[PDB]
Amino acid sequence: HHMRTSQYLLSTLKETPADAVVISHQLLLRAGMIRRLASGLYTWLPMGLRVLRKVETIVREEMNAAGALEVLMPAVQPAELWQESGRWEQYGPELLRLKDRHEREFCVGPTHEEVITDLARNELNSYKQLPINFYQIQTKFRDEIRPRFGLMRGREFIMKDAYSFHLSQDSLQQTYDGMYQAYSKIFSRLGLDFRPVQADNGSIGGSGSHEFHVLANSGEDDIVFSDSSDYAANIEKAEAVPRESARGSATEDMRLVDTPNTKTIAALVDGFQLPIEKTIKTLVVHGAEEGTLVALIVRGDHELNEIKAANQPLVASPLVFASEAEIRAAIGAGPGSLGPVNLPIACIVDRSVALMSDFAAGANIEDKHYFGVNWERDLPLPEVADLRNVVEGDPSPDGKGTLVIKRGIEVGHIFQLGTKYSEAMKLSVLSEQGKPVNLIMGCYGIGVSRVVAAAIEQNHDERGILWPSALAPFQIALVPLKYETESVKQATDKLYAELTAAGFEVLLDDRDKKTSPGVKFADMELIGIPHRIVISDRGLSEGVLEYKGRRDSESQNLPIGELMSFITEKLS
Amino acid sequence: HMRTSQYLLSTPADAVVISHQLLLRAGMIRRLASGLYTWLPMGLRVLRKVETIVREEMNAAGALEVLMPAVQPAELWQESGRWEQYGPELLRLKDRHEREFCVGPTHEEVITDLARNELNSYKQLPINFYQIQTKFRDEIRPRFGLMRGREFIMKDAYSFHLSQDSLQQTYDGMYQAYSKIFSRLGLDFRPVQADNGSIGGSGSHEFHVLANSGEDDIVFSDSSDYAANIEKAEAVPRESARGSATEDMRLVDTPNTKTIAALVDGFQLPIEKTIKTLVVHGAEEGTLVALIVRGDHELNEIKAANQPLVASPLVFASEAEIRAAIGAGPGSLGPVNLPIACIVDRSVALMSDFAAGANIEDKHYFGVNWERDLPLPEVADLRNVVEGDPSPDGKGTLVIKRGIEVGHIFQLGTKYSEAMKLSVLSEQGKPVNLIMGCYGIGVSRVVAAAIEQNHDERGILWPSALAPFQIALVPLKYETESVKQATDKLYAELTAAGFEVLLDDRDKKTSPGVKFADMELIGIPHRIVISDRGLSEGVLEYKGRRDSESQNLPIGELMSFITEKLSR
Numbered sequence A: 001h002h003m004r005t006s007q008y009l010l011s012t013l014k015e016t017p018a019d020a021v022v023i024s025h026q027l028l029l030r031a032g033m034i035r036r037l038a039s040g041l042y043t044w045l046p047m048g049l050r051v052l053r054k055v056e057t058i059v060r061e062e063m064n065a066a067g068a069l070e071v072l073m074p075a076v077q078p079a080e081l082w083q084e085s086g087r088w089e090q091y092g093p094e095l096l097r098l099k100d101r102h103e104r105e106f107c108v109g110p111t112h113e114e115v116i117t118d119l120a121r122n123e124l125n126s127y128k129q130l131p132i133n134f135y136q137i138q139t140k141f142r143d144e145i146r147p148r149f150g151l152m153r154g155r156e157f158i159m160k161d162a163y164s165f166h167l168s169q170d171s172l173q174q175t176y177d178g179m180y181q182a183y184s185k186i187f188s189r190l191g192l193d194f195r196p197v198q199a200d201n202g203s204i205g206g207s208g209s210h211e212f213h214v215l216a217n218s219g220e221d222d223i224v225f226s227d228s229s230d231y232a233a234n235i236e237k238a239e240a241v242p243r244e245s246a247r248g249s250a251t252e253d254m255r256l257v258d259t260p261n262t263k264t265i266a267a268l269v270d271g272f273q274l275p276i277e278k279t280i281k282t283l284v285v286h287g288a289e290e291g292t293l294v295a296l297i298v299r300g301d302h303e304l305n306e307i308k309a310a311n312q313p314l315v316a317s318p319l320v321f322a323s324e325a326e327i328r329a330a331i332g333a334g335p336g337s338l339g340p341v342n343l344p345i346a347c348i349v350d351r352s353v354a355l356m357s358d359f360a361a362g363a364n365i366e367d368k369h370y371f372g373v374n375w376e377r378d379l380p381l382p383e384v385a386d387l388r389n390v391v392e393g394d395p396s397p398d399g400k401g402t403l404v405i406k407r408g409i410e411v412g413h414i415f416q417l418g419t420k421y422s423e424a425m426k427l428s429v430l431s432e433q434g435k436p437v438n439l440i441m442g443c444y445g446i447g448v449s450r451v452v453a454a455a456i457e458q459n460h461d462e463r464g465i466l467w468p469s470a471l472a473p474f475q476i477a478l479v480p481l482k483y484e485t486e487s488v489k490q491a492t493d494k495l496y497a498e499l500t501a502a503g504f505e506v507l508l509d510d511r512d513k514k515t516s517p518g519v520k521f522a523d524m525e526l527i528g529i530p531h532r533i534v535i536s537d538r539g540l541s542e543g544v545l546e547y548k549g550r551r552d553s554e555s556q557n558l559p560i561g562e563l564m565s566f567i568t569e570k571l572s
Numbered sequence B: 001h002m003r004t005s006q007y008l009l010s011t012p013a014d015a016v017v018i019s020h021q022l023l024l025r026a027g028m029i030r031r032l033a034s035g036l037y038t039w040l041p042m043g044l045r046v047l048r049k050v051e052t053i054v055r056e057e058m059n060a061a062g063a064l065e066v067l068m069p070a071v072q073p074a075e076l077w078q079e080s081g082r083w084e085q086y087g088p089e090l091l092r093l094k095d096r097h098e099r100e101f102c103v104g105p106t107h108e109e110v111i112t113d114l115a116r117n118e119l120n121s122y123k124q125l126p127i128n129f130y131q132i133q134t135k136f137r138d139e140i141r142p143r144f145g146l147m148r149g150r151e152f153i154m155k156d157a158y159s160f161h162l163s164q165d166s167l168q169q170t171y172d173g174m175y176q177a178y179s180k181i182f183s184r185l186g187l188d189f190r191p192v193q194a195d196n197g198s199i200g201g202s203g204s205h206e207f208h209v210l211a212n213s214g215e216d217d218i219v220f221s222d223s224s225d226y227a228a229n230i231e232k233a234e235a236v237p238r239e240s241a242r243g244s245a246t247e248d249m250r251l252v253d254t255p256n257t258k259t260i261a262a263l264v265d266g267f268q269l270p271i272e273k274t275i276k277t278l279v280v281h282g283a284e285e286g287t288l289v290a291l292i293v294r295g296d297h298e299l300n301e302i303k304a305a306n307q308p309l310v311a312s313p314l315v316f317a318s319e320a321e322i323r324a325a326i327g328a329g330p331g332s333l334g335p336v337n338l339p340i341a342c343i344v345d346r347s348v349a350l351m352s353d354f355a356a357g358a359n360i361e362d363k364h365y366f367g368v369n370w371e372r373d374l375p376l377p378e379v380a381d382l383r384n385v386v387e388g389d390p391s392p393d394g395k396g397t398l399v400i401k402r403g404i405e406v407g408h409i410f411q412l413g414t415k416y417s418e419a420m421k422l423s424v425l426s427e428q429g430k431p432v433n434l435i436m437g438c439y440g441i442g443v444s445r446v447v448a449a450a451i452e453q454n455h456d457e458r459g460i461l462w463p464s465a466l467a468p469f470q471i472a473l474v475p476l477k478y479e480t481e482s483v484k485q486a487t488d489k490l491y492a493e494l495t496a497a498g499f500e501v502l503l504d505d506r507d508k509k510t511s512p513g514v515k516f517a518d519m520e521l522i523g524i525p526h527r528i529v530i531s532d533r534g535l536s537e538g539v540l541e542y543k544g545r546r547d548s549e550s551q552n553l554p555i556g557e558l559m560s561f562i563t564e565k566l567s568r
């Protein structure tokens, strides 16, 4: 019973290299860890499954230590539950819907809030049972429009999803903080450089959601940190405050200027030799009040934050931009020619805009701008709000330090749900005093298969994968030279048995001479095995084995009599 | 602490079999919809214990664990032909791009696709891949709780070989691994021969948990190793010779005589002197074949289909087809003046002076004798065995038992590799279509099967390997500080020594009687009761799940005592 390369290192051919463009995808294919079945659907090959199980074990251990109870819920779920929550329609096209042979309707679960709520309303009948936290490690399906980046944006993927139930907000906060702490322990034990960040929870301010990110150059998410405080937020959530302390004095009188073929900030800047920080962008969106429009204004060098925009009560959520036809009907001028002066719709300006002076804006007259605009003198200041994305070097909104923007891969997300589900689905328990209480809920998700890829995105070199110690699929590769020779065979097999008996996970390279030593060595490093031992006649003659670490440049001789001492020391 | 206030969800017209009843009542599972169940905390613990044992034995047999997707592209199923052929149990769907998929009921096509990409050298063979993975089968009437669900957990393995001998070695290894699995799960089980789709041969076996509720009949020789499911079990006659003709054949009017019972009762004939004639579709398009068994016997539809002359799968001729071919209807058929091909059962060949429908409506021949009145047709084994029949290997007699199928193994030949073009060059450079086996265990079914076999009036009896916890701590008044500290200490010591402990932490509103009944329902094999009185006398109160009476252990020797009980 040896684990052998002839079995574990399968063919990686009929893989078009154009098809893998991020390093984790390339290396998971080349290392024989995953194989594509179809768009966003991958098999875990024997080597890759070993890594997945190590992630799952650590996640389960830390969920258990935090007092959560493991369950396992079905993938296929009745549409009727999804209609109770409203997500049957609202979830959108990522929900995979189907019908069974009796014409009954179902989805494949992308997540399990409705199922666990249905469970709770049947299983939780007393306050003495609360608080409680249920979790599973289970395969989800989300019909991502363009599955890509290997495991990072698959359609079928493994999630640890937990759901907690409470009679009060304070109770929820306690579990939520416990889940945050458990996540920190998980990503620490997985040997990943990671950060928790504040995330959007569907309103201005507050702290009802956090994300956990693996730091990596390829990460799709912008995450924001103070260089001096513990402030940390994804860019959707990060609060923007102005660099300026006050509004500058007006130095220019307002004038109406002809600006043909001037429909972008760049054209205005280049065309009229304006600093970009003296220009504004006026974006028109649908109002929450049906049939109304709202103008949202940011400085010309800033971007509208669509989450912040939507979260304004006056602005419809989700965010909908006005069409050119709607804008022209409302204002009598088109995109490129809009601004706050003589604007016949409501307006909200960014904090930085409120402090601008002598600024340029579309005149709400086609192909004209006002220059030298000043608040109060030329028009009243409208409502002010935080509307923009932060940018590198902005002030930290807690007043401590300046902001830096890094890239992250989202591997965890936790949420406070209040009574969103318990109200919709009638989940209530009587308090100790005998009052009906709609249960207050949290939910907590880790992208378990994503974590595997994220680890590689963060940890790789020119020779292939670098695993954190907790993730390596094997600890030791034995590379016998001439394993067919009786002396090498028996010494190699003896070494395998001694190491395995000490609890080490060992892979034996049993491949014949058509695989050169050089290829074998490169294979073991590509897969990311942290240690190798080479066995040869020459070494045995001198009573040595040849050792090399994955992160060592040179091999070293290992006296056979110090095997366990030497190797135990390396694996600590 | 693992505590009852969290775990215990112990508390139904749809629940008719005992395992289903008890899994609900013990808070192990909860129904979401038809054939869809959630594993509750206590139940999941049992499932994981099954999975661990299965994984251990698969790994020891040299199989490599993988994990394949549930959603599978239709194109692979079209290659094998099972996109259509699997039938309505295949759950078919379309994604947002209108591409077609199924949810996997099994994974032959996916693993074959993997193999044609991953296996390119004879040096890689033989190889055996397996997964423990949730399947979906759209069972027309999901029932029996976990036994016939729609979503269920299967361990499925698939082996690849360059020769039949190589397959046989792995197949035998899987058979042996299965034996170890069900032995370690503490189940009383038997392996049996199963249908392979031809007469004779040994390319399929099933593993059954013996249980009174078992849907499957399985057959054993009392004196030999012979073991087969009823589909597969070979039938041989009890008689050694055909009797001499003592009666002349004669045509008899027999109105309202369309069953064996009407003929036996109506005309006072022994049932062993009557025959049933069943008309089925021939393999040759548009033809019919008559299959004949003795009146006390039943046609085995697997044996019938496996006859080369008979279309497979088996299709029975309609009344209209029968009337058109023969000129009489069901109830009036037989082998005399029969204008279609006929095959008779081994037992029928030995009959004499027998009665048969005349192939004339409402008439029978009596006094029929082979050779004299008509030629003997082809003879075959067509009937089901019955209790007390001769063992077909000549050694002993057969007994029939009821089984729950929990495992099934198959030799597939090149069925998939030919259709999907899976081939590897031999050492000689000749392309070889890979010869395949597959091996399945119904992991979630096993949990229910265990209870079907092992239960009593107080609830579940788990095999030691399956029990969700080893010890229940039942403090009588846990609010009492002396009790709380002693119990908590006990929990810590026990847990520290590696034992799995449930602490009943529930308040006074739950009587000690209910606590005891709950721990027995859920099947925990050992309890320790902690009372202040007991602690004052330096004694704890122990009881095994299968014991009649509790006993008083000295508070000091509990650890040695418990350790011994759990060291077997």
Ligand SMILES: Nc1ncnc2cc(-c3cccc(S(=O)(=O)NC(=O)[C@@H]4CCCN4)c3)cc(F)c12
Residues within 6 Å of the ligand: A110, A111, A112, A113, A142, A144, A151, A152, A153, A154, A155, A156, A157, A158, A159, A160, A161, A162, A411, A412, A413, A414, A443, A444, A445, A446, A447, A448, A449, A450
């Ligand atoms: N395509 C994809 N491929 C691979 N891994 C993916 C992982 C996620 C993922 C992971 C963690 C949390 C979330 S979430 O933020 O959506 N939150 C919830 O689902 C909540 C918490 C748990 C109960 N419901 C999504 C999403 C994807 F799309 C993936």
Ligand SMILES: Nc1ncnc2cc(-c3cccc(S(=O)(=O)NC(=O)[C@@H]4CCCN4)c3)cc(F)c12
Residues within 6 Å of the ligand: B105, B106, B107, B108, B137, B139, B146, B147, B148, B149, B150, B151, B152, B153, B154, B155, B156, B157, B406, B407, B408, B438, B439, B440, B441, B442, B443, B444, B445
């Ligand atoms: N409804 C149901 N509920 C719960 N458990 C069920 C279990 C099975 C089951 C178990 C073992 C083998 C088989 S099989 O004989 O079909 N063989 C194959 O699938 C082969 C071997 C493995 C690769 N393919 C079916 C079938 C069901 F329908 C179930």
